[PDB]
Amino acid sequence: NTATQRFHEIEKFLLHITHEVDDLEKTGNKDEKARLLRELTVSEAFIEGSRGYFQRELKRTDLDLLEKFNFEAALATGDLLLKDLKALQKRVQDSE
């Protein structure tokens, strides 16, 4: 619930970026491809920072097992999609 709402932001980027890949592939693919990959790079950057935030809250003591569960939930959510960012990146990178 909470973890997914939090990382739904990047999830919007995921859908946007995949679309943008397609778009650029039929639209130009001249430089947009590389630029778009850099945008996913930015995407992983803010999520990685937020992941680091959860890791800090995990040490905050002002958390309950509930909150720990949220960090663990979000960390798992973020990690997989971050892995997905790179995986798709390599696909898009490969098409270059």
What CATH number corresponds to the domain at position 78? 1.20.58.970
First to last CA, the chain: 37
Q: Is the dihedral of CA 50, 7, 35, 93 positive or negative?
A: positive
**Cα–Cα distance between 71 and 69 in angstroms, integer?**
5
Contacts of 74 (CB under 8 A, 6+ apart): 2, 3, 6, 7, 50, 51, 54
Helix (H) or strand (E) holding 60: none
Q: Which domain holds residue 16?
A: 1-96
**Cα–Cα distance between 15 and 10 in angstroms, integer?**
9
Q: Tokens for 37?
A: 């990959």
The domain tally of the chain equals 1
